[PDB]
Amino acid sequence: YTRVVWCAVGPEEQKKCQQWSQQSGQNVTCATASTTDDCIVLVLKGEADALNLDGGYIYTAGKCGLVPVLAENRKSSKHSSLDCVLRPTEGYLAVAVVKKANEGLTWNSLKDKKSCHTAVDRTAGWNIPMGLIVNQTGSCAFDEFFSQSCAPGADPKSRLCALCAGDDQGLDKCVPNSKEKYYGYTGAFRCLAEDVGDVAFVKNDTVWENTNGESTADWAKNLKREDFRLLCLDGTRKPVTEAQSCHLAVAPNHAVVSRSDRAAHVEQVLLHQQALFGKNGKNCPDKFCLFKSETKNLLFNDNTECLAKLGGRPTYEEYLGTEYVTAIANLKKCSLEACAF
Ligand SMILES: *[C@@H]1O[C@H](CO)[C@@H](O[C@@H]2O[C@H](CO)[C@@H](O)[C@H](O)[C@H]2NC(C)=O)[C@H](O)[C@H]1NC(C)=O
Ligand SMILES: *[C@@H]1O[C@H](CO)[C@@H](O[C@@H]2O[C@H](CO)[C@@H](O)[C@H](O)[C@H]2NC(C)=O)[C@H](O)[C@H]1NC(C)=O
Ligand SMILES: Cc1c(Cl)cccc1Nc1ccccc1C(=O)O
Ligand SMILES: *[C@@H]1O[C@H](CO)[C@@H](O)[C@H](O)[C@H]1NC(C)=O
Ligand SMILES: [Fe+3]
Ligand SMILES: [Zn+2]
Ligand SMILES: [Zn+2]
């Protein structure tokens, strides 16, 4: 064993990472960067080993040679004999969510509305909806489709950032890390809940986890699922209990990536760290829970039951799936070979 150097994105992940490192007796230590892209560069340079990534960022890391190691696995819909670590992953449902009270907004009337996105380059947040929209409109001018948005990672003076709010101080508007008030699944959903945006592009789970008292957080504690609808590609609106019939795509789960040459070591260490700090882990909750952060999804989604071994030593293309990979390649033609770095 060597120590594994985790890469934390922004200061709130970094703080979580430091508690993990303390509790692991330095089996894990922490590098931190301002953006996911910057953490991927640290890993490429060998200044960090690994981080957990959305599928759109796996595409970026993968084009640069990093490889998937273990995947987030959340509670299966169906009972399984299989241990979590062995259970195959089931993707998550990317959806578009609006206020029920915003009547008559549908997928087909999104143009010139206000949008909330988890971040540029992320799956449910970006790649799926904007790939869909570019294709449906026949235009690469996706930066002109909504009147204003919060899409963290975009140009802070552009309309794609006009709705983002920055941190407590109002600084770091539109930065793609949890300091941006509207960053990520929970930030984009809060962007909708507070009626900053007309639509949020998130996943099905986000809606459930932040409504009907599932979150105690001040902005979320009062929210009721019935006040929300999903937008279906057929132009219909459904209640959020129907995401299986009204989603934009099924996404590949967030997964850990590292360099090939560190993958087996990163895997071993993680399997052991989750035995200690994961769901039901020997030292969670008394000491530290790797998969909790007060709904802030820091390092890992809060709904992760375990990190699960992958079948078939998949390359990043195999992990993401050919179709998703081709959807991303297609969209990036708007703004098929090389590492972006
Ligand atoms: C947007 O349209 C593109 C361009 O047609 C779609 O790309 C095709 O996807 C199919 C199914 O995976 C492939 O058989 C074709 O080879 C792809 N065409 C090209 C030119 O690459 C893409 O999937 C659509 N995007 C989204 C997000 O649905
Ligand atoms: C959409 O996401 C929600 C939230 O994760 C899912 O509801 C959970 O489903 C599990 C497994 O069925 C239940 O044991 C949980 O108690 C549910 N959580 C809550 C907060 O209600 C829901 O199944 C997902 N829907 C689809 C179609 O995938
Ligand atoms: C539509 C869908 C369902 Cl329903 C389930 C699962 C996936 C999809 N779609 C896609 C899957 C991968 C890549 C691109 C797409 C897309 O067409 O946006
Ligand atoms: C640190 O790692 C070594 C080697 O795997 C092991 O003996 C020890 O259990 C680990 N401790 C923690 C607290 O993760
Ligand atoms: Fe995602
Ligand atoms: Zn589907
Ligand atoms: Zn293979």
Tokens 């052991």: give the residue. 272
CATH of the domain at 128: 3.40.190.10
Q: Is 113 helix (H, G, I), strand (E, B) or coil?
A: coil
Q: Is 289 helix (H, G, I), strand (E, B) or coil?
A: coil
Atom of ligand 1 nearest to the CA of 128: 27
Q: Indicate whether 221 and 234 sit together in one domain.
A: yes
- Listed resolution, Å: 2.0
Atom of ligand 1 nearest to the CA of 322: 12
The answer to whether 315 touches 62, Cβ cutoff 8 Å, is: yes
Q: Indicate whether 264 and 292 sit together in one domain.
A: yes
For residue 240, give the nearest of 99, 73, 90, 109 by alpha carbon: 99
Q: Is 96 helix (H, G, I), strand (E, B) or coil?
A: strand
| Burial class (CB within 10 angstroms; exposed 0-12, middle 13-18, buried 19+) of 170 | exposed
Q: Are strands 28-33 and 4-9 parallel, antiparallel or unpaired?
A: parallel
DSSP string across 185-245: HHHHHHHHHTTS-SEEEEEHHHHHHTSTTS--STTTTT--GGGEEEEPTTS-EEEGGGGGG
Does the residue 200 lie in any domain?
A: yes
DSSP state, 117? E
Report d(CA 41, CA 48) in Å as an integer: 9
Ligand nearest to the CA of 26: 4
Q: Are strands 255-259 and 66-74 parallel, antiparallel or unpaired?
A: antiparallel
Q: Is 265 annotated as a binding residue?
A: no
Ligand 7 centre from 312 Cα, in Å?
Answer: 6
Ligand 2 centre from 62 Cα, in Å?
Answer: 30
Torsion angle (degrees, nearest 10) of CA 333, 98, 96, 332: 10
Q: Indicate whether 182 and 243 sit together in one domain.
A: yes
Q: Indicate whether 62 and 87 sit together in one domain.
A: no
Report d(CA 182, CA 114) in Å as an integer: 13
Residues sharing a CB contact under 8 Å with residue 133, sequence separation 6 or more, in sequence order: 110, 142, 145
DSSP state, 85? T
Name beta bridge partners: 304. Answer: 74
Q: Are strands 228-231 and 237-239 parallel, antiparallel or unpaired?
A: antiparallel
Ligand nearest to the CA of 211: 2
Report d(CA 276, CA 292) in Å as an integer: 14
Report d(CA 323, CA 91) in Å as an integer: 14
Q: Is 128 in the pocket of ligand 3 (CB under 6 A)?
A: yes
Q: Indicate whether 203 and 273 sit together in one domain.
A: no
Report d(CA 4, CA 266) in Å as an integer: 6
Name beta bridge partners: 200. Answer: 97, 116
Rounded to 5, what percent of the chain is helix, strand, coil?
A: 35, 20, 45
Residues recorded for the chain:
341
| Burial class (CB within 10 angstroms; exposed 0-12, middle 13-18, buried 19+) of 233 | middle
Tokens 């035995």: give the residue. 275
Which residue's C-alpha comes closest to atom 3 of ligand 3?
249
Q: Indicate whether 245 and 266 sit together in one domain.
A: no
For residue 184, give the nearest of 126, 128, 145, 133 by alpha carbon: 126
For residue 310, give the nearest of 93, 59, 84, 68 by alpha carbon: 68
Q: Indicate whether 197 and 152 sit together in one domain.
A: yes
The answer to whether 167 touches 179, Cβ cutoff 8 Å, is: yes
Residue 49, number of CB atoms within 10 A of its CB: 26
Q: Indicate whether 149 and 24 sit together in one domain.
A: no
For residue 277, give the nearest of 18, 73, 20 by alpha carbon: 20
Residues having CB closer than 6 A to ligand 2 are 75, 77, 93, 204-205, 208-209, 214, 243-244
DSSP state, 312? S
Half-sphere exposure of 22 (CA within 13 A, CB side): 9
Token pair recorded at residue 81: 């004999």
Q: Indicate whether 271 and 239 sit together in one domain.
A: no
The answer to whether 124 touches 203, Cβ cutoff 8 Å, is: yes
Tokens 């909330």: give the residue. 116
Residues sharing a CB contact under 8 Å with residue 264, sequence separation 6 or more, in sequence order: none
Burial 90-128 (b: 16+ CB within 10 A, else e): ebbbbbbbbbeeeeebbbeebeebbbbbbbbbbbbbbbb
Which amino acid is present at 322? Answer: T
SS (H, E, C) 138-183: CCCCHHHCCCEEECCCCCCCCHHHCCCCCCCCCCCCCCCCCCCCCC
Ligand nearest to the CA of 92: 2
Residue 115's domain comprises 74-254+317-327
User: To 5 degrees, how large is the angle CA 61–CA 309–CA 299?
Assistant: 55
For residue 273, give the nearest of 223, 298, 307, 224 by alpha carbon: 307
Q: Indicate whether 95 and 144 sit together in one domain.
A: yes
Residue 295, number of CB atoms within 10 A of its CB: 18
Q: Indicate whether 127 and 207 sit together in one domain.
A: yes
Does the residue 335 lie in any domain?
A: no
From the centroid of its chain, how far is CA 68?
Answer: 15
Which residue's C-alpha comes closest to atom 11 of ligand 3?
324
Method used experimentally: X-ray
Which residue's C-alpha comes closest to atom 15 of ligand 1?
326
Which residue's C-alpha comes closest to atom 13 of ligand 3?
324
